[PDB]
Every structure is written in C-alpha cells, then in structure tokens.
C-alpha cells in the first residue's frame, strides 16, 4: 500500500489518459502543482543569497 498521488483504489486506474488528458481529474491537479514548485525552486536560490 505505497503512496500514490492519484487514487490507488480501483486497481490504480486513475492514471489512464483516454478521452483527453485534461479530463483526467488527477492530471489537472498535477498541472496545478507545476506553478508552485516553479516559484519555490526559482526563488530559494534568490532568497538564500540575501
């Protein structure tokens, strides 16, 4: 029972990208993690210098 970003239940089938990837309710959440991890890792080197 390891960690899964999407849902492990129902034999971990929330990863299929049929019927468009924007319809994969988990995938849009991953698209919403990109901007945050972008700013963390583009400003930590900036801030730590100061």
């Amino acid at each position: 029972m390891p960690l899964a970003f999407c849902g492990t239940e129902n034999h971990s089938a929330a990863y299929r990208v049929d019927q468009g990837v924007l319809n994969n309710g988990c995938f849009v959440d991953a698209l919403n993690v990109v901007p945050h991890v972008f700013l963390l890792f583009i400003t930590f080197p900036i801030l730590f210098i100061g």
């Binding site: 990208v17 990109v34 583009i42 730590f48 210098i49």
Partner: protein
C-alpha cells in the same frame, strides 16, 4: 545586481548551502517535468498493451 560578487563574499557554509540548493532545485523541478510528461503521455499506468513509453 552583482550576484556573482555577492556569492564570493558569502561564507563557505552558506556558499555550500546555496550550491546545494541550486542543484537540488534544478534537479527536483525537472523531476516534476519528467514525471508530468510521462503521466500525461499515459505510459505511467503499467500494462501489457500497445503503448510504448516515451521515457522507459
């Protein structure tokens, strides 16, 4: 403005931390990019199917 000159003035402990943070931030950011592109490609759900993974 002169980040390079600023980095030189930093102590070695803080320079090592910034050295570490710079590499770690680049490594982890592109890890998300590789993970997301594979996940969008659909080659992340395992199975004996017609799909051929972009990143094995």
């Amino acid at each position: 403005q002169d980040v390079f000159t600023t980095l030189v003035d930093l102590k070695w402990p803080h320079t090592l931390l910034i050295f570490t943070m710079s590499f770690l931030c680049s490594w982890l950011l592109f890890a998300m990019v590789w993970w997301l592109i594979a996940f969008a490609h659909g080659d992340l759900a395992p199975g004996e199917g017609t799909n051929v993974p972009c990143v094995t």
